[PDB]
Amino acid sequence: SSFSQHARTSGRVAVEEVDEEGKFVRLRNKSNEDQSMGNWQIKRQNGDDPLLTYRFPPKFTLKAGQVVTIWAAGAGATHSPPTDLVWKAQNTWGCGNSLRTALINSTGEEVAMRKLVRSVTV
Protein backbone atom coordinates (compact mmCIF):
# COMPACT_ATOMS: atom_id res chain seq x y z
CA SER A 1 0.00 0.00 0.00
CA SER A 2 1.73 3.14 1.43
CA PHE A 3 3.09 0.69 4.05
CA SER A 4 4.26 -2.87 3.38
CA GLN A 5 5.02 -5.20 6.36
CA HIS A 6 7.85 -7.69 5.99
CA ALA A 7 10.06 -10.07 7.89
CA ARG A 8 12.45 -12.84 6.76
CA THR A 9 14.10 -15.81 8.52
CA SER A 10 16.93 -18.30 8.74
CA GLY A 11 14.64 -21.22 10.05
CA ARG A 12 16.01 -21.97 13.58
CA VAL A 13 14.93 -18.33 14.27
CA ALA A 14 11.85 -16.55 12.91
CA VAL A 15 10.54 -12.99 13.57
CA GLU A 16 7.19 -14.60 14.33
CA GLU A 17 5.07 -11.87 15.95
CA VAL A 18 6.36 -8.58 14.66
CA ASP A 19 4.37 -5.91 16.43
CA GLU A 20 3.96 -2.80 14.23
CA GLU A 21 5.22 0.84 14.34
CA GLY A 22 8.08 -0.14 16.74
CA LYS A 23 6.07 -1.94 19.53
CA PHE A 24 7.96 -5.29 19.78
CA VAL A 25 9.89 -7.97 17.99
CA ARG A 26 8.54 -11.33 19.28
CA LEU A 27 11.26 -13.81 18.34
CA ARG A 28 10.81 -17.57 18.22
CA ASN A 29 13.16 -20.34 17.29
CA LYS A 30 11.08 -21.93 14.43
CA SER A 31 13.42 -24.81 13.24
CA ASN A 32 14.85 -27.13 15.88
CA GLU A 33 18.40 -25.96 16.57
CA ASP A 34 19.27 -24.47 20.03
CA GLN A 35 21.18 -21.19 19.28
CA SER A 36 23.48 -19.21 21.75
CA MET A 37 21.82 -15.74 22.42
CA GLY A 38 24.72 -14.72 24.65
CA ASN A 39 26.63 -14.30 21.36
CA TRP A 40 23.95 -11.95 19.74
CA GLN A 41 23.84 -8.40 18.49
CA ILE A 42 20.42 -6.83 17.64
CA LYS A 43 21.06 -3.94 15.17
CA ARG A 44 18.89 -1.24 13.54
CA GLN A 45 19.28 1.25 10.69
CA ASN A 46 16.63 4.03 10.93
CA GLY A 47 15.96 5.93 7.57
CA ASP A 48 18.67 8.41 6.78
CA ASP A 49 18.63 8.88 10.61
CA PRO A 50 21.11 7.22 13.21
CA LEU A 51 22.98 3.83 13.24
CA LEU A 52 22.15 1.78 16.37
CA THR A 53 22.92 -1.67 17.74
CA TYR A 54 22.12 -3.34 21.06
CA ARG A 55 24.69 -5.95 22.40
CA PHE A 56 23.82 -9.28 24.19
CA PRO A 57 25.36 -10.89 27.43
CA PRO A 58 27.81 -14.00 26.94
CA LYS A 59 25.72 -16.56 29.09
CA PHE A 60 22.36 -17.47 27.46
CA THR A 61 21.05 -20.02 24.78
CA LEU A 62 17.67 -20.15 22.81
CA LYS A 63 15.95 -23.45 22.55
CA ALA A 64 14.86 -25.53 19.46
CA GLY A 65 11.32 -24.04 19.56
CA GLN A 66 11.12 -21.82 22.72
CA VAL A 67 10.03 -18.07 22.56
CA VAL A 68 11.93 -14.79 23.44
CA THR A 69 11.01 -11.06 23.19
CA ILE A 70 13.41 -8.22 22.41
CA TRP A 71 12.45 -4.46 22.20
CA ALA A 72 12.46 -0.65 22.99
CA ALA A 73 12.35 1.04 26.55
CA GLY A 74 8.95 2.90 26.23
CA ALA A 75 7.18 0.45 23.88
CA GLY A 76 5.01 -1.07 26.73
CA ALA A 77 7.76 -3.63 27.49
CA THR A 78 9.44 -4.19 30.93
CA HIS A 79 13.18 -4.77 31.68
CA SER A 80 12.86 -8.53 32.13
CA PRO A 81 15.67 -11.05 31.07
CA PRO A 82 16.03 -13.75 29.67
CA THR A 83 12.50 -13.13 28.27
CA ASP A 84 12.12 -9.38 27.65
CA LEU A 85 15.28 -7.58 26.55
CA VAL A 86 14.46 -3.88 26.79
CA TRP A 87 17.06 -1.42 25.32
CA LYS A 88 17.83 2.03 26.74
CA ALA A 89 19.25 4.28 23.93
CA GLN A 90 15.89 4.37 22.10
CA ASN A 91 12.40 4.12 23.61
CA THR A 92 10.79 3.07 20.21
CA TRP A 93 10.95 4.67 16.71
CA GLY A 94 8.59 7.74 16.96
CA CYS A 95 9.14 8.75 13.28
CA GLY A 96 10.28 6.60 10.33
CA ASN A 97 10.07 6.09 6.55
CA SER A 98 11.97 2.82 5.94
CA LEU A 99 13.11 0.93 9.08
CA ARG A 100 15.26 -2.21 8.72
CA THR A 101 15.74 -4.28 11.89
CA ALA A 102 17.72 -7.47 12.12
CA LEU A 103 19.23 -9.87 14.64
CA ILE A 104 22.86 -11.20 14.18
CA ASN A 105 22.98 -14.88 15.31
CA SER A 106 25.05 -16.88 17.80
CA THR A 107 28.18 -16.94 15.46
CA GLY A 108 27.75 -13.50 13.81
CA GLU A 109 25.69 -14.36 10.69
CA GLU A 110 22.40 -12.43 10.14
CA VAL A 111 19.50 -14.89 10.71
CA ALA A 112 16.22 -13.16 11.56
CA MET A 113 15.21 -9.88 10.02
CA ARG A 114 12.14 -7.54 10.31
CA LYS A 115 11.48 -4.56 7.95
CA LEU A 116 8.79 -1.84 8.16
CA VAL A 117 8.74 0.21 4.97
CA ARG A 118 6.33 3.20 4.68
CA SER A 119 6.68 6.64 2.92
CA VAL A 120 8.56 6.16 -0.39
CA THR A 121 8.72 2.34 -0.70
CA VAL A 122 9.12 1.05 -4.33
d(CA 73, CA 91): 4
Listing DSSP states for 3-59 in one string gives SEEEEEE-SSSEEEEEETTTTEEEEE--SS----TTS-EEEEEETTS-EEEEEPPTT
**Domains, in order of start, for the chain:** 1-122 (2.60.40.1260)
Q: What angle do CA 81, 83, 84 make, to 5 degrees?
A: 75
Burial class (CB in 10 A: 0-12, 13-18, 19+), 116: buried
Distance of CA 110 to the CA centre of its chain: 11
The structure's method of determination equals NMR
